[PDB]
Write a protein that binds this ligand. Structure first.
Ligand SMILES: O=c1c(O)c(-c2ccc(O)c(O)c2)oc2cc(O)cc(O)c12
Length: 156
């Protein structure tokens, strides 16, 4: 089955800058977020089909999160990717897709729009707990790229 969720988050940063900063996420994230040790490209060029391995330390234990880039649309500040393995993929989930768009806010900031597609194995249903966890970690990630841009004005 497929379960869909919609969320929005706001920022002071204009979408073009934020979107450029999001392209640099691989280097930004381990700097800002303590639990993130590294982001490695396993397969691909950054574009669609690229398979990334995130290395996380939680409760002193090293764990891996696997991301697959689904599509990119630079003109529309749009970026689609999937959790396709590791600790962030619950056992009854095939994959969890994050569809991302930034649009200009009122006041020349951004509104980041998220569409979340939770793909279950057959009859299975998504875990409320894991959703809470994914949503908190996702929002923090957005904040890490934002905090970064805000803290380094000249770079974007
Ligand atoms: O740091 C992170 C983290 O701990 C988890 C996570 C999620 C569900 C679990 O059940 C769990 O044990 C860990 O996901 C993440 C997902 C990201 O995209 C980025 C992160 O930095 C984390």
């Amino acid at each position: 089955g497929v379960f869909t969720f919609e969320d929005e988050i706001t920022s002071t940063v204009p979408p073009a800058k934020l979107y450029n900063a999001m392209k640099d996420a691989d280097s930004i994230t381990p700097k800002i977020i303590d639990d993130v040790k590294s982001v490695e490209i396993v397969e691909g060029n950054g574009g669609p089909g690229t398979i990334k391995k995130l290395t996380i330390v939680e409760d002193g234990e090293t764990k891996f999160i696997l991301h697959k880039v689904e599509s990119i649309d630079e003109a529309n500040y749009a970026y689609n990717y999937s959790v396709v393995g590791g600790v962030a993929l619950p056992p009854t989930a095939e994959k969890i897709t994050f569809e991302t768009k930034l649009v200009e806010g009122p006041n020349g900031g951004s509104i980041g729009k998220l569409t979340l597609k939770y793909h279950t194995k057959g009859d299975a249903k998504p875990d409320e707990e894991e959703l809470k966890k994914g949503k908190a970690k996702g929002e923090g990630l957005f904040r890490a790229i934002e905090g970064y841009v805000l803290a380094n004005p000249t770079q974007y």
